[PDB]
């Protein structure tokens, strides 16, 4: 059992840039963080990053998300967001290696995009 922290609410403007932090307790490690958007039917994988502690983030996603790692957190930035992209953005944190494998799901950050 691990914990995941991310702010409850973030606002973005017409520039379409939103930033939030996904924080987790590392008891060790190789990390994968995935950002999920709560669509009415299912979750949508917005972006994913992997990295080893101390290294820069490797983004599988094609330039939708950028960010950095600072110990036990990742500082994410989403761009291209419009008003209808408003929703709950959940980051899934996987501590993959060395074992044991850990999975954490955050409460999600509500992103309100204005104009």
């Amino acid at each position, epitope marked *: 059992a691990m914990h995941v922290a991310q702010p409850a609410v973030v606002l973005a403007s017409s520039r379409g840039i939103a930033s939030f932090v996904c924080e987790y307790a590392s008891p060790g490690t*190789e990390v*994968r963080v*995935t950002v999920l958007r709560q669509a009415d039917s299912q979750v949508t994988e917005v972006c994913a990053a*992997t*990295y080893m502690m101390g290294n820069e983030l*490797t983004f*599988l996603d094609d330039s939708i998300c950028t960010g950095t790692s600072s110990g036990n957190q990742v500082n994410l930035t989403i761009q291209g967001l419009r008003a209808m992209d408003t929703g709950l953005y959940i980051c899934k944190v996987e501590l993959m290696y060395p074992p044991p494998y850990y*999975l954490g799901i955050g409460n999600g950050t509500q992103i309100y995009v204005i104009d």
Partner: nanobody, 119 residues
């Protein structure tokens, strides 16, 4: 427009050695994770080796001390050195930007290449 091109598979005598190559175009192999996964006829996939973004490497118990995963940065390629091959190593071998823990919409799989062990 990511692509994974495989090669180095065929027939080999038991006790012999092969090297599979995964030619990657789309992402940097040196800064990504990748896995070698095989499916023996009549069974599910088996994850035989993993390399994580920072170079850390694991192997399945059935394969430890016999296979070696490696990545060449200058050629952006993923290799699986196979050695001391037995009949059980007969399978279709895939390279994938995936991890055995959980799947992902960003998982990318090669087309697969067949390795046969016949005495």
């Amino acid at each position: 427009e990511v692509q994974l091109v495989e090669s180095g598979g065929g027939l080999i005598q038991p006790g012999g050695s092969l090297r599979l190559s995964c030619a990657v175009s789309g992402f940097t192999v040196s800064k990504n994770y990748m896995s070698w996964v095989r499916q023996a006829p009549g069974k599910g996939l088996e994850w035989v080796s993993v390399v994580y973004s920072g170079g850390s490497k694991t192997y399945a118990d059935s394969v430890k001390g016999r296979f070696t995963i490696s990545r060449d940065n200058s050629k952006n390629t993923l290799y699986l050195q196979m050695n001391s091959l037995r009949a059980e190593d007969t399978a279709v071998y895939y390279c994938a930007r995936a991890v055995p823990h959980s799947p992902s919409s960003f998982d990318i799989w090669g087309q697969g290449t067949m390795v046969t062990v016949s005495s």
